[PDB]
Amino acid sequence: EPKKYAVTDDYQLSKQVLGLGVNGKVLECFHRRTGQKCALKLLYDSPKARQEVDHHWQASGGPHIVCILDVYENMHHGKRCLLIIMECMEGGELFSRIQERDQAFTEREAAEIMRDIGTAIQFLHSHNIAHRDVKPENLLYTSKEKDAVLKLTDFGFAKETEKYDKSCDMWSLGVIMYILLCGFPPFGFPNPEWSEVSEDAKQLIRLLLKTDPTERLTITQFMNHPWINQSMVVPQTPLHTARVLQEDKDHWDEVKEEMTSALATMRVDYDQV
């Protein structure tokens, strides 16, 4: 577990920000003797920070989860902090990468992306962790290369559980799939964009987007759905997604912000009716 000596003994730090999570900022850094580029998450010590560390550490090593390399407990600006060192996710965000394709983005590619995410959620749900904030910011690629791996990160709202909490992940899966398939969020399946999408795909989304949490597919049901289970047999049909992502790039931040809002809403103890 946690190293009590200075992070800076092992890592050269940078001021380049790679991301922003509820509990802290993500900075680029380099391992001093290896030279490997890594990412540094600075958590000011708190029981929430300690939970994040605990949950991410448990999840680390699971399929399609951003790995922790080390964790430091340091003093920084007179305050006790935790520094999570993680693999550098040099490919950036999932949907930025889709956008940066021109090339065909096909239904089978979305099915394989969705399977990867499901495989992460499967791992987490079987270890009774619910993530509770699966969203575009948290879905990242290991490189900019063709063979990059999609991983999930940020365990700052994770909870060691509750079917309810698990169903918030299942819901994220349906939102992300929806955007994967057309380029815009569900917040029906309109033409032209949905015109050519599988009935399987649209059926899966309806089962994940149930207004009633208990009516939503569980991860096991999701992974056994033929659209996921038989993802490689899914139609190679060209989607509108990249094109739409490009066209509406100006409204992307808003999409991100209302998903964040939606997910926070699902996390409140008592909500309106």
Ligand SMILES: O=C1NCCc2[nH]c(-c3ccnc(-c4cnc5ccccc5c4)c3)cc21
């Ligand atoms: O916990 C988090 N909260 C939300 C945003 C975030 N990004 C990361 C993260 C982790 C590792 N690497 C990156 C990263 C992302 N994007 C990049 C683009 C280009 C070069 C390097 C990059 C590294 C981000 C962690 C978290």
